[PDB]
Design brief:
The structure is a homotetramer. Chain A is an alpha/beta fold. Chain A has one domain (1-385). Helix content of chain A is 47%, strand content 8%. Chain A is built from 16 helices and 10 strands. Chain A has helices spanning 13-16, 34-44, 53-56, 63-80, 107-127, 149-170, 194-201, 216-220, 226-235, 263-276, 294-320, 322-330, 333-336, 345-350, 360-364, 370-381, and strands spanning 9-12, 48-52, 86-88, 131-134, 140-141, 175-178, 188-189, 210-212, 243-244, 282-284. Chain A has an 8-stranded parallel beta sheet. In chain A, helix 10 links the parallel strand 9 and strand 10. The longest helix of chain A has 27 residues, at 294-320. The radius of gyration of chain A is 23 Å and the shape is globular. Chains A and B meet through helix 5, helix 6, helix 7, helix 9 and helix 10 of A and helix 5, helix 6, helix 7, helix 9 and helix 10 of B. The structure holds Xylitol (4 copies) and magnesium ion (4 copies). One magnesium ion binds at residues 179, 215, 243, 285 of chain A. Chains A, B, C, D: Involved in D-xylose catabolism. Chains A, B, C, D: This is Xylose isomerase. Chains A, B, C, D: Mg(2+) 2 binds at residues 215, 218, 253, 255. Chains A, B, C, D: One of its GO terms (molecular function) is xylose isomerase activity. Chains A, B, C, D: It is an enzyme of class 5 (isomerase).
């Protein structure tokens, strides 16, 4: 279970660089220089790193300070062979974004947010990113009267449309990925789940440029099934990126290392990504707990990759087991994949076997055999086959 | 707060007719004849009733028994002036639907579900319904291996496409409304929220025929904000119907009368529907608690309509108050409604006032004034102005 | 992973006998004769069965019919060597209990509930049960004004006190176990968690006769940590019985087979029970999903026992690993077990090393090493050591 | 709805002084001098203020700086007539407390936490506080192996016992109030609800010195009913203090102003406190949202008191309405308050009317009339009577 760069494991600078400040506590770790994080992640077998603008260039920097920060970063990438497959903008930390960026009630803040984003799209392309993520963490409300959501969705569509116009006019080869979250830090966030994000995208001027970046813990904060949501994003052709972590149910976002939280969900998620041939980055958006020193930060990071690789082994074993393939036929997964009425509507209507002569009692008596199938999955996960 | 038929309040036969059977308990009330429910609801000031096929025609009935049941129902409608604006199919009670209807793993069950649906679309049109609802309550899974969700979504698209082909071929003037729910009775249900349903619709062959039927309590079982979800459905032009009830948070579906549960949410929901000019039925999909006799059933029903009408009064008072209109301008709701960059992308990029000369500290210091606005809303809700 | 009767695995008659009726669906399985369930569970390696009165003697039976039902049951126990370690009363299915049993607002219902309970305590002792469980599934409310909770707790204390007086007067060797649940079927149930139940017990006349019967899924419906709750019940000396199942988070009670739901929680629960030397029954209170026929019912039951035995192996391996014992010392679990101030209060106050000369920065810099410890636990659970 | 000091409304210094730092954002407001907060709260009609040690004396201060800070604070109290009814310790912000205070795995940290607490108990008594609150916000775990909960509860009992020994030895007239919370900032916190706290108290050496300080939003983060929990704390005689705020369901702790969140819960909470004659402080533990400037901070604070006073009016009107008193008798709330079996156990057993001659069908047919009662409560809350 040793990772190599071909496994496409990536990490944000803000993940291992989290200093441990929380709602009730000061930092427990000092700040990490991005150059150090690049070197240490390369040693652990990572493929690449991601960044918000402000992780890499401290807010307020001059053009000369900005150039120095980039130069040093690019040298660390050259020294390690690390890639940058994705970048994003910080439109949530600075006080100016307290009511949002793209959907701030103040128009001047909206225009600023757009300019800050465009400046970092340029840098992202320079560094070789192919996906630009957008997490609207401040887009929302704590109270009903503060945000007219129809107007806010008009302003969110206006912003993404302008960004699509910019990337096309410049000829860049980069696509956008919208990251939903249901709440935190706002009491409710706009586009709160994968579904809302998918639906919004279909009303953009150039929908082909936009997909989703779902995060395990975010969908779990709404109690939803994360592998099901990913299945719908794949079905729509919109899974452009994914953020992997863990979460123990409906509560604050924990950002535990991947494999922690709902372990069975993590197994079915890896089964799906590997079966569907997802070829994008396996990005970990996690926070080493603030109980840990730097040795525990790197242990937590290594654990993310290790657990993905164990689960991949076990899901492949499950799908290759002749006994499991028999069990899938016993539960009629083969029949689910066949069309209901390839013969057409008129044929269906004239088929007495579909209604007038259908024996509903015979059909109802047939067991689905799902519990034997799920115990074989459990036995495979635990290495008890 | 006396309702009249012009208020467009409707009720399902299964709501006031719920006999009180739950996971742990037998029925506490005897069955109601649909004719009685029509008469009693008319006396309370309702506009109309809705039905599943099997609420009106007991499952397994002959064509002669079916005709007698319809004849008697139509006479009660004629005797009272009650309308039938919506109908739906029961694809969840009979054992044959234990793994679903449209997405059952068994193909023969899928074909049966379609034929049972088409038979009731014919009856719905005969009785004058303009919306046909589809709640896939059995579409889903308790375990990961039982349902390949990509295949299931193919089968769900195939079914809705065939239904769209049927209504077009027959020339009917009826539209479909998909009702999402996150779980119960399946451990996870497919299309679990308004967003997932909206996104699915955009992949149907004839998307214009399909909208959503959201239910208050269903979105609340995922902890989501129901007025926000409705705002997105309106923004997409897909709010074809709505189910009104109450729910106390993330737990089993309670189906409390409307106004119970999250009262502030109910206020912001009525504010939105009335402001947006929603002209569809105000449908109550609720269950009088099984502690009640028939006097309490009718009291609970009357309470649904009463609470809508109080909330409508209070939301209109809130929006008409000069002090509230001032407060909305103080919180920049006016600026939210104005375009971010009507001047265009190039103008935005050349505007030094949007970035190079923007004072982020001045902008960050401006309070949003949302708490004074929300206390005026509270004072209006409570009649404390 | 073959179970034997020494593993003390037990099952309720209502578990494998669940016919599959849910809020939205009719039964999918026919009724099982208790004699058949006893025989089939013995073949699977169970130790014993449990029962509600009404599972064994249909409600309304005569004394002669009651004697016949018991006689046949006792013969099946004699024929198989199965035991009955626990029994309980059904105070939730019949309509008379729609507002509760012990805390029904109607006094005559309260008195009936007590008499029905006492009649079955007699039978429980005759059959050899040592624990009598009480699940107040109807004790609670859907609305605030319906139940004065102080008065209700007086009536619940009065009922348990009378039951304690009965068992002492008759000289029975049986103890009571109160089963908390937060909601379902009532909108909120009284004594909703292990903690509330433990606190209530300390106000009974004879607290030594009463403990708790916690259920995995019940505490999980409140988002709580089930191994922590059991740890507190053990610490108080009140873990008299336990109900094992699975649950996927905060939603309706699923009653999945044990090992399903939160698998990591199930691992830490078995670690604790085995480490603490819990010697009581391992009782499964689960429902085979209504998708299954009878072959799937017995597969689901076997799976309960299998998963407990795998988890027991893995938790014992974890605790016996020298590397894990080193890791426990690295995270100071040894120091947690030592007294804070065995030297006493005055010594603590005079110790300059506890405040005046304490280096808070040195202490704050020490990492806890919890993530390496938790990755060793994960590696042990998955068989990746 | 003008508050006066006789209404006993109090506020923590940390509430209106919250600068707006959250998991994802920097501060939006500058720090408030405690002297200013005392003066501004007095102008709004508050009765008093509360404090953590470190709110009033910056961490690390010298004895001379400490004396200056106290002197200035006491002058502001003298200048305004504000009281200090409660104080508490900060055992959660400094990095040294990252694994807890009283239950830290490191013994030296445990001893430090105790000394820091005792130093502030002395100051609390000097300033006239009668209640000392203890919120163990860092007592818990993110992972199963990190904390043996039986050992941790031994260390938590040891700490409270030592504190009880200190206050008795010094002869102070002050009592302790334990504040439960289910999670945040730890993934699970020990003593997560009112019930767990009540049960723990009964195992302390001197239980009479300890009660609970429940917080609205904390019990709501577990989906529990807050008025029910308070009813149990009152029933045990352990409601020593209460923290009032709002929360929108199961999610991160929002700390909204009181009246926001679950408004119907807030109504039933005020009904109960006033009916039970709770004579303690009405303490608001809330955070003005970080969207607000200082004008919005004071508006939010005023709103807390205003909403309590509206709800008090409406609950008193509800209880005084002859129609509601009739409705309470119709739902048998009178019978709930009468003993079940004052005649004794033997009389109950010999009463044929309690079992042999009880008509369960007649009793089951009686409706409870709860929905008419709850619509009268709603009409009273909304001022629609
Ligand atoms: O909840 C925080 C989000 O997960 C962010 O880390 C986005 O992925 C990037 O801004
Ligand atoms: O949760 C149950 C659903 O709300 C149904 O009542 C649909 O509206 C109609 O089948
Ligand atoms: O939620 C249902 C409960 O778990 C019952 O099965 C009790 O254990 C016994 O009445
Ligand atoms: O969740 C935070 C808690 O509510 C604290 O404010 C305690 O009341 C005091 O330390
Ligand atoms: Mg992310
Ligand atoms: Mg509905
Ligand atoms: Mg149970
Ligand atoms: Mg508090």
């Amino acid at each position: 279970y040793q990772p190599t760069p071909e496994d496409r494991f990536t990490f944000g600078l803000w993940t291992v660089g989290w200093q441990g400040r929380d709602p009730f506590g000061d930092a427990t770790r000092r700040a990490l220089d991005p150059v150090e994080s690049v070197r240490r992640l390369a040693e652990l077998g990572a493929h690449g790193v991601t960044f918000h603008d402000d992780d890499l260039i401290p807010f307020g920097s001059s053009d000369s300070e900005r150039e120095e920060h980039v130069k040093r970063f690019r040298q660390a990438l050259d020294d390690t062979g690390m890639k940058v497959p994705m970048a994003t903008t910080n439109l949530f930390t600075h006080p100016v974004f307290k009511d949002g960026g793209f959907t701030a009630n103040d128009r001047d803040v909206r225009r600023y947010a757009l300019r800050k984003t465009i400046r970092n799209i340029d840098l992202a392309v320079e560094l070789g990113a192919e996906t630009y993520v957008a997490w609207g963490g401040r887009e929302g409300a704590e109270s009903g009267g503060a945000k007219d959501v129809r107007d806010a969705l008009d302003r969110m569509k206006e912003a993404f449309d302008l960004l699509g116009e910019y990337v096309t006019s410049q000829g860049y080869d980069i696509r956008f990925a919208i990251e939903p979250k249901p709440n935190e830090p706002r009491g409710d966030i706009l586009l709160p789940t994968v579904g809302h994000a998918l639906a919004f995208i279909e009303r953009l001027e150039r929908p082909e440029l936009y997909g989703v970046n779902p995060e395990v813990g975010h969908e779990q904060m709404a109690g939803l099934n994360f592998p099901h949501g990913i299945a719908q994003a794949l079905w729509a052709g919109k899974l452009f990126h994914i953020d992997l972590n863990g979460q123990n149910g409906i509560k604050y976002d924990q950002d535990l290392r991947f494999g922690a939280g709902d372990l069975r969900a993590a197994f079915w998620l890896v089964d799906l990504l590997e079966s569907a041939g997802y070829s994008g980055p396996r990005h970990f958006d996690f926070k080493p707990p603030r109980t840990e020193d730097f040795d525990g930060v790197w242990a937590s990071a290594a654990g993310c990759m290790r657990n993905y690789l164990i689960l991949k082994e076990r899901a492949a074993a499950f799908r290759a087991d002749p006994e499991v393939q028999e069990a899938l036929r016993a539960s009629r997964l083969d029949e689910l994949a066949r069309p209901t009425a390839a013969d057409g509507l008129q044929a269906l209507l004239d088929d007495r076997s579909a209604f007038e002569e259908f024996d509903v009692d015979a059909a109802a008596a047939r067991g689905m055999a799902f519990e034997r199938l799920d115990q074989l999955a459990m036995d495979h996960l635990l290495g008890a086959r």
